[PDB]
Coordinates of C-alpha atoms in Angstrom, one line a residue:
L1 CA -0.4 -23.7 -15.9
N2 CA -2.0 -25.4 -12.8
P3 CA -5.6 -24.0 -12.4
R4 CA -5.3 -24.4 -8.6
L5 CA -2.3 -22.1 -8.4
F6 CA -3.3 -19.7 -11.2
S7 CA -6.7 -18.5 -12.5
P8 CA -7.1 -17.7 -16.2
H9 CA -6.9 -14.0 -15.4
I10 CA -4.1 -12.3 -13.4
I11 CA -6.2 -9.1 -12.8
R12 CA -9.8 -10.0 -11.9
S13 CA -11.5 -6.6 -12.5
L14 CA -10.7 -2.9 -12.0
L15 CA -11.8 -3.4 -8.4
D16 CA -8.9 -6.0 -8.0
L17 CA -6.6 -3.4 -6.4
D18 CA -6.1 -1.6 -3.0
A19 CA -9.3 0.3 -2.2
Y20 CA -7.3 3.4 -1.2
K21 CA -6.2 3.9 -4.8
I22 CA -9.8 4.4 -6.0
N23 CA -10.5 6.5 -2.9
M24 CA -7.5 8.7 -3.5
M25 CA -8.5 8.9 -7.2
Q26 CA -11.7 10.6 -6.0
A27 CA -9.7 13.2 -4.0
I28 CA -7.4 13.8 -6.9
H29 CA -10.4 14.0 -9.3
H30 CA -11.9 16.7 -7.0
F31 CA -8.9 18.9 -6.2
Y32 CA -6.2 18.1 -8.8
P33 CA -7.8 17.1 -12.1
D34 CA -4.9 18.6 -14.2
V35 CA -1.9 17.6 -12.0
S36 CA 0.6 15.2 -13.6
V37 CA 2.9 12.6 -12.0
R38 CA 5.6 10.1 -12.7
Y39 CA 6.0 6.8 -10.8
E40 CA 9.0 4.5 -10.9
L41 CA 9.1 0.8 -10.2
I42 CA 12.1 -1.3 -9.9
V43 CA 12.3 -5.0 -9.8
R44 CA 15.6 -6.3 -8.2
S45 CA 17.4 -9.6 -7.7
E46 CA 16.0 -11.7 -10.6
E47 CA 18.5 -13.0 -13.1
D48 CA 17.7 -12.6 -16.8
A49 CA 14.7 -10.2 -16.1
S50 CA 14.9 -9.9 -19.9
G51 CA 12.6 -13.0 -19.8
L52 CA 9.8 -11.6 -17.6
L53 CA 9.6 -8.4 -19.7
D54 CA 7.6 -10.1 -22.6
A55 CA 4.6 -11.4 -20.6
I56 CA 4.6 -8.4 -18.4
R57 CA 4.2 -6.2 -21.5
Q58 CA 1.3 -8.3 -22.7
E59 CA -0.5 -8.1 -19.3
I60 CA 0.1 -4.3 -19.0
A61 CA -1.2 -3.8 -22.5
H62 CA -4.2 -5.8 -21.5
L63 CA -5.1 -3.2 -18.8
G64 CA -6.1 -0.9 -21.7
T65 CA -9.0 -3.3 -22.4
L66 CA -10.5 -3.2 -18.8
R67 CA -13.5 -1.2 -17.9
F68 CA -15.6 -0.5 -14.9
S69 CA -18.9 -2.5 -15.3
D70 CA -22.2 -1.2 -14.0
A71 CA -22.0 -3.9 -11.4
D72 CA -18.6 -2.6 -10.2
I73 CA -20.1 0.9 -10.0
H74 CA -23.2 -0.4 -8.2
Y75 CA -20.9 -2.1 -5.7
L76 CA -19.0 1.1 -4.9
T77 CA -22.3 3.1 -4.7
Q78 CA -23.5 0.8 -1.9
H79 CA -20.3 -0.3 -0.2
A80 CA -18.2 2.9 -0.6
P81 CA -20.8 5.5 0.2
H82 CA -18.2 8.3 0.7
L83 CA -17.4 8.2 -3.0
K84 CA -19.3 11.0 -4.8
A85 CA -22.0 10.0 -7.4
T86 CA -20.4 12.5 -9.9
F87 CA -17.0 10.7 -9.5
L88 CA -18.6 7.2 -9.9
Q89 CA -20.4 8.4 -13.0
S90 CA -17.1 9.5 -14.5
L91 CA -15.7 5.9 -14.0
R92 CA -18.3 4.6 -16.5
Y93 CA -16.2 5.9 -19.3
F94 CA -12.7 5.6 -17.7
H95 CA -9.9 3.5 -19.1
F96 CA -6.1 3.3 -19.1
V97 CA -4.0 4.2 -22.2
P98 CA -0.9 2.1 -21.4
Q99 CA 0.9 2.7 -24.7
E100 CA 1.0 6.4 -23.7
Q101 CA 1.4 6.0 -19.9
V102 CA 3.7 3.1 -19.4
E103 CA 7.4 2.6 -20.4
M104 CA 9.6 -0.3 -19.4
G105 CA 13.0 -1.7 -20.1
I106 CA 16.1 -3.4 -18.7
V107 CA 18.7 -1.2 -17.1
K108 CA 22.3 -2.5 -16.6
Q109 CA 20.3 -5.9 -14.8
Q110 CA 17.1 -4.7 -13.4
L111 CA 13.6 -4.3 -14.8
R112 CA 12.4 -0.6 -14.8
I113 CA 8.8 0.5 -15.3
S114 CA 8.0 4.2 -15.6
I115 CA 4.4 5.4 -15.4
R116 CA 3.6 9.0 -16.5
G117 CA 0.3 11.0 -17.0
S118 CA -2.3 12.8 -15.0
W119 CA -2.4 11.8 -11.4
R120 CA -6.1 10.9 -11.7
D121 CA -5.5 8.7 -14.7
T122 CA -2.4 6.8 -13.5
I123 CA -3.0 6.4 -9.8
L124 CA -4.8 3.0 -10.3
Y125 CA -1.8 1.4 -12.1
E126 CA 0.4 0.8 -9.0
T127 CA -1.1 -2.3 -7.5
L128 CA -2.2 -3.7 -10.9
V129 CA 1.3 -3.5 -12.2
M130 CA 2.8 -4.9 -9.0
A131 CA 0.3 -7.8 -9.0
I132 CA 1.1 -8.5 -12.6
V133 CA 4.9 -8.5 -12.2
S134 CA 4.5 -10.7 -9.1
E135 CA 2.2 -13.2 -10.8
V136 CA 4.1 -13.4 -14.1
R137 CA 7.2 -14.3 -12.2
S138 CA 5.2 -17.0 -10.3
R139 CA 3.9 -18.4 -13.6
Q140 CA 7.2 -18.3 -15.3
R141 CA 9.6 -19.3 -12.5
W142 CA 7.5 -21.1 -9.8
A143 CA 4.9 -22.9 -11.8
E144 CA 5.7 -26.3 -10.2
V145 CA 4.8 -25.2 -6.6
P146 CA 2.4 -27.8 -5.2
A147 CA -1.1 -26.3 -5.6
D148 CA -2.1 -27.2 -2.0
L149 CA 1.1 -25.7 -0.4
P150 CA 0.0 -22.1 0.1
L151 CA -3.1 -23.2 2.0
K152 CA -1.2 -25.9 4.0
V153 CA 1.2 -23.1 5.1
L154 CA -1.6 -20.8 6.1
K155 CA -3.5 -23.5 8.0
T156 CA -0.5 -24.3 10.1
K157 CA 0.0 -20.6 11.0
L158 CA -3.7 -20.2 11.8
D159 CA -3.5 -23.2 14.2
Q160 CA -0.5 -21.7 16.0
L161 CA -2.1 -18.2 16.1
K162 CA -5.3 -19.6 17.7
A163 CA -3.3 -21.7 20.2
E164 CA -1.3 -18.7 21.3
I165 CA -4.3 -16.4 21.5
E166 CA -6.0 -19.0 23.8
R167 CA -2.9 -19.5 25.9
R168 CA -2.1 -15.9 26.5
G169 CA -5.8 -14.8 26.8
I170 CA -5.4 -12.2 23.9
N171 CA -8.7 -10.5 23.1
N172 CA -7.6 -7.7 20.7
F173 CA -6.1 -9.6 17.7
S174 CA -7.5 -7.9 14.5
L175 CA -6.3 -8.6 10.9
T176 CA -6.7 -6.4 7.8
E177 CA -5.7 -8.3 4.7
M178 CA -3.4 -6.1 2.5
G179 CA -1.6 -8.6 0.3
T180 CA -2.8 -7.7 -3.1
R181 CA 0.3 -5.8 -4.4
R182 CA 2.7 -8.7 -3.7
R183 CA 0.5 -11.8 -4.0
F184 CA 1.9 -15.0 -5.4
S185 CA -1.2 -15.0 -7.7
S186 CA -4.8 -13.7 -7.7
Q187 CA -5.9 -17.4 -7.1
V188 CA -3.7 -17.7 -4.1
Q189 CA -5.0 -14.5 -2.6
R190 CA -8.5 -15.6 -3.4
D191 CA -8.0 -18.9 -1.5
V192 CA -6.2 -17.2 1.3
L193 CA -9.1 -14.8 1.9
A194 CA -11.6 -17.7 1.7
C195 CA -9.7 -19.5 4.3
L196 CA -9.4 -16.5 6.7
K197 CA -13.1 -15.9 6.4
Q198 CA -13.8 -19.6 7.2
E199 CA -11.2 -20.0 10.0
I200 CA -11.0 -16.7 11.9
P201 CA -14.0 -14.5 10.8
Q202 CA -14.2 -13.0 14.3
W203 CA -10.7 -11.5 13.8
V204 CA -10.9 -10.2 10.2
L205 CA -11.5 -6.5 10.2
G206 CA -11.6 -6.6 6.4
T207 CA -9.4 -6.4 3.2
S208 CA -7.9 -3.6 1.2
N209 CA -9.0 -5.4 -2.0
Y210 CA -12.4 -4.1 -3.3
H211 CA -12.9 -7.1 -5.7
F212 CA -12.4 -9.6 -2.9
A213 CA -14.3 -7.4 -0.4
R214 CA -17.2 -7.9 -2.8
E215 CA -16.6 -11.6 -3.4
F216 CA -16.5 -12.5 0.3
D217 CA -18.7 -9.7 1.8
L218 CA -15.9 -8.3 3.8
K219 CA -15.4 -4.7 4.7
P220 CA -13.1 -2.8 2.3
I221 CA -10.3 -0.9 4.3
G222 CA -8.2 1.9 2.9
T223 CA -5.5 3.9 4.6
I224 CA -4.1 7.0 2.9
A225 CA -0.9 6.2 1.1
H226 CA 2.4 8.3 1.3
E227 CA 1.9 9.5 -2.2
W228 CA -0.9 11.8 -1.2
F229 CA 1.4 13.6 1.3
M230 CA 4.4 13.4 -1.1
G231 CA 2.5 14.9 -4.0
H232 CA 1.6 18.0 -1.8
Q233 CA 5.4 18.8 -1.7
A234 CA 4.9 19.9 -5.3
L235 CA 1.5 21.5 -4.9
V236 CA 2.0 23.8 -1.9
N237 CA 5.0 25.0 0.0
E238 CA 7.1 22.0 1.2
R239 CA 6.7 23.0 4.8
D240 CA 2.9 23.0 4.5
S241 CA 2.7 19.9 2.4
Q242 CA 1.9 17.3 5.1
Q243 CA -0.6 19.6 6.9
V244 CA -2.5 20.6 3.8
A245 CA -2.6 16.9 2.7
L246 CA -4.2 16.0 6.1
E247 CA -6.7 18.8 5.8
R248 CA -7.6 18.1 2.2
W249 CA -8.3 14.4 2.8
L250 CA -11.1 15.5 5.2
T251 CA -12.6 18.0 2.6
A252 CA -12.5 15.4 -0.2
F253 CA -15.2 13.2 1.4
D254 CA -18.1 13.6 3.9
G255 CA -17.0 10.7 6.2
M256 CA -14.4 8.5 4.4
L257 CA -12.2 6.4 6.8
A258 CA -9.2 8.6 7.7
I259 CA -6.1 6.8 8.8
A260 CA -2.9 8.8 8.2
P261 CA 0.6 7.3 7.8
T262 CA 3.0 9.2 10.0
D263 CA 6.3 8.6 8.3
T264 CA 6.3 10.4 5.0
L265 CA 8.7 12.8 6.8
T266 CA 9.4 11.9 10.5
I267 CA 7.3 11.2 13.6
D268 CA 8.3 14.6 15.0
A269 CA 7.2 16.4 11.8
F270 CA 3.9 14.5 11.8
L271 CA 3.3 15.3 15.5
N272 CA 3.9 19.0 14.8
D273 CA 1.3 19.0 12.1
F274 CA -1.3 16.7 13.7
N275 CA -3.1 19.3 15.7
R276 CA -6.1 18.9 18.0
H277 CA -8.7 19.5 15.2
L278 CA -7.0 17.0 12.9
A279 CA -6.3 14.4 15.7
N280 CA -10.0 14.4 16.6
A281 CA -11.2 14.2 13.0
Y282 CA -8.9 11.4 12.0
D283 CA -9.9 7.8 13.0
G284 CA -6.3 6.9 13.6
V285 CA -2.8 6.5 12.2
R286 CA -0.7 3.8 10.5
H287 CA 2.7 2.5 11.5
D288 CA 5.1 1.7 8.6
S289 CA 8.7 2.1 9.7
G290 CA 10.9 2.1 12.8
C291 CA 10.1 0.6 16.2
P292 CA 6.3 0.0 16.6
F293 CA 6.4 0.1 20.4
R294 CA 8.1 3.5 20.6
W295 CA 5.8 4.8 17.8
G296 CA 2.6 3.7 19.4
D297 CA 3.7 5.0 22.8
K298 CA 4.5 8.4 21.2
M299 CA 1.1 8.5 19.4
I300 CA -0.7 7.6 22.7
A301 CA 1.2 10.4 24.5
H302 CA 0.2 12.8 21.8
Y303 CA -3.5 12.0 22.0
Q304 CA -3.3 12.4 25.8
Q305 CA -1.6 15.8 25.5
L306 CA -4.4 16.9 23.2
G307 CA -7.1 15.5 25.6
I308 CA -8.1 12.8 23.2
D309 CA -8.9 9.3 24.6
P310 CA -6.7 6.9 22.6
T311 CA -9.0 4.0 23.2
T312 CA -11.3 5.7 20.7
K313 CA -8.6 5.8 17.9
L314 CA -7.2 3.1 15.7
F315 CA -3.5 2.1 15.1
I316 CA -2.9 0.0 11.9
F317 CA 0.5 -1.7 12.1
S318 CA 1.8 -2.6 8.6
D319 CA 5.6 -2.9 8.7
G320 CA 6.3 -6.4 7.4
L321 CA 4.4 -8.3 10.1
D322 CA 3.9 -11.9 10.9
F323 CA 1.5 -13.3 13.5
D324 CA 4.1 -13.6 16.3
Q325 CA 5.0 -9.9 15.9
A326 CA 1.3 -9.1 15.9
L327 CA 0.6 -11.0 19.1
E328 CA 3.4 -9.2 20.9
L329 CA 1.9 -5.8 19.8
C330 CA -1.5 -7.1 21.0
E331 CA -0.1 -7.6 24.5
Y332 CA 1.8 -4.3 24.6
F333 CA -1.2 -2.2 23.5
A334 CA -4.1 -4.1 25.2
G335 CA -6.5 -1.6 26.9
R336 CA -4.7 1.4 25.6
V337 CA -5.8 2.0 22.0
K338 CA -7.7 0.1 19.2
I339 CA -5.5 -1.9 16.9
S340 CA -5.4 -3.9 13.7
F341 CA -2.6 -5.5 11.7
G342 CA -2.3 -4.8 8.0
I343 CA -0.5 -7.8 6.6
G344 CA 0.6 -8.4 3.0
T345 CA 3.3 -10.8 2.0
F346 CA 3.1 -13.0 5.1
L347 CA -0.5 -13.8 4.0
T348 CA -0.5 -13.9 0.2
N349 CA 3.0 -14.8 -0.7
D350 CA 4.5 -17.2 1.8
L351 CA 5.6 -20.8 0.8
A352 CA 7.5 -21.3 4.0
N353 CA 10.9 -21.4 2.2
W354 CA 9.8 -24.2 -0.1
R355 CA 12.7 -25.3 -2.3
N356 CA 12.3 -25.9 -6.0
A357 CA 13.8 -29.1 -7.6
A358 CA 17.2 -27.3 -8.0
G359 CA 17.1 -26.6 -4.2
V360 CA 16.5 -22.9 -4.4
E361 CA 14.4 -21.5 -1.4
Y362 CA 11.3 -19.6 -2.6
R363 CA 11.2 -15.8 -1.7
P364 CA 8.7 -13.3 -3.0
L365 CA 9.8 -10.9 -5.8
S366 CA 11.5 -7.8 -4.5
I367 CA 9.6 -4.9 -6.0
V368 CA 9.3 -1.3 -5.1
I369 CA 7.3 1.6 -6.4
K370 CA 7.7 5.3 -5.8
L371 CA 6.0 8.5 -6.7
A372 CA 9.0 10.3 -8.3
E373 CA 7.6 13.5 -9.5
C374 CA 4.5 15.7 -9.4
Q375 CA 3.8 18.7 -11.7
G376 CA 7.3 18.1 -13.0
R377 CA 8.8 18.7 -9.6
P378 CA 10.6 16.2 -7.3
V379 CA 8.9 14.8 -4.2
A380 CA 10.4 12.6 -1.5
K381 CA 9.7 10.2 1.3
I382 CA 12.1 10.3 4.3
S383 CA 10.5 8.0 6.9
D384 CA 11.5 7.0 10.5
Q385 CA 14.2 4.8 8.9
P386 CA 16.4 7.5 7.4
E387 CA 18.5 5.1 5.3
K388 CA 15.4 4.5 3.4
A389 CA 15.0 8.2 2.3
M390 CA 14.1 8.3 -1.5
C391 CA 14.4 11.3 -3.9
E392 CA 15.8 11.6 -7.5
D393 CA 17.0 15.2 -6.7
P394 CA 19.4 15.3 -3.8
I395 CA 19.2 19.1 -3.5
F396 CA 15.4 18.9 -3.2
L397 CA 15.7 16.2 -0.5
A398 CA 18.3 18.3 1.4
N399 CA 16.1 21.4 1.3
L400 CA 13.0 19.4 2.4
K401 CA 15.0 18.0 5.4
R402 CA 16.1 21.5 6.3
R403 CA 12.5 22.8 6.2
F404 CA 11.5 20.1 8.8
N405 CA 14.6 20.5 10.9
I406 CA 15.7 17.0 9.9
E407 CA 19.5 16.4 10.4
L408 CA 21.3 16.5 7.1
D409 CA 24.6 14.6 6.5
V410 CA 26.6 17.2 4.4
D411 CA 29.4 14.9 3.5
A412 CA 27.0 12.4 2.1
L413 CA 25.2 15.2 0.2
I414 CA 28.5 16.4 -1.3
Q415 CA 29.2 12.9 -2.6
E416 CA 25.7 12.6 -4.0
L417 CA 26.1 16.0 -5.8
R418 CA 29.4 14.9 -7.2
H419 CA 27.9 11.5 -8.4
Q420 CA 24.9 13.1 -10.1
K421 CA 27.3 15.5 -12.1
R422 CA 29.2 12.6 -13.5

């Protein structure tokens, strides 16, 4: 393997993950120490996945050997001050048990990985497993990519970004790097962050990766993931789930950054839960599905109805962005609200359609994870793109929609019930 494309280690430390995973681990440690969960990951559209499965197993097994070092803990003590000393002391002994927590196999072809255990002990797997599957695929299938290509591609985009910012007089572009989970490799992410820091420091709000926040002295940014809201569907009554999850984030920490996603259910359900006390306490909200213009306008109107000045709140846009989409959003929201763009794939896994020797255009690995179950009960995400609703139990999902007055397609449900019985 080419040392300019791939470092010796895929996972760099137990801080080499999205910061919100550790942060949410604190909240789960505090409130839900005996709650169990099951996550499901599916890798699609890779022929003979039989072949990735060997090196993935080895890497996943290797997680069982990782530990938090005193230096990792010292780093969080200083740079993540809303983490409780008691929680950080408990990390000193923490490790994974992957032979108990992780199963994987081929289902006929896709690669399926199932992660089961306590919520506190399994929550950190998600981005580590996604980064591993991504990078193993890179090593195995895209090893001949020219080592200088990823940075050439980024440099060209950064030139065009700067040029458009100058031309259009945009003064509100802000970038939050969030490409750990689908990076081409940890080396490529490392170089990408180094380059951003060198080229556009004035526009980098920070990175979700704790390890690279350390390495480059960048601010670590977390937003709360959907799984916190989805898990509450099992822990309280479904109708109270989103509201309780909003409240409990605030009581988990003195002053942790509080940015809520709005589409675990729908924007209307979110607005009905996001009362004046919650809207003032939260620093802002994250957009992840559906039209960002309509979303942001609706959120602004909500703040204004509640007498909150939206220019004091932050919108993080994170729905598959590129820089031209981001600049459009900059113009539309200028003067009205604070903004930043949480960008993943476009930053850390973009080879500009580079073709291999056989002429195949490069695309990132298609990979999804979901929280499937909590306390042995189903949980679901609906979102503002309904076609993307996800639940293993179609009766649960139908009931959850009914409790939130979300339109239910009965004919589709009947087909889903008949399918499941077979």
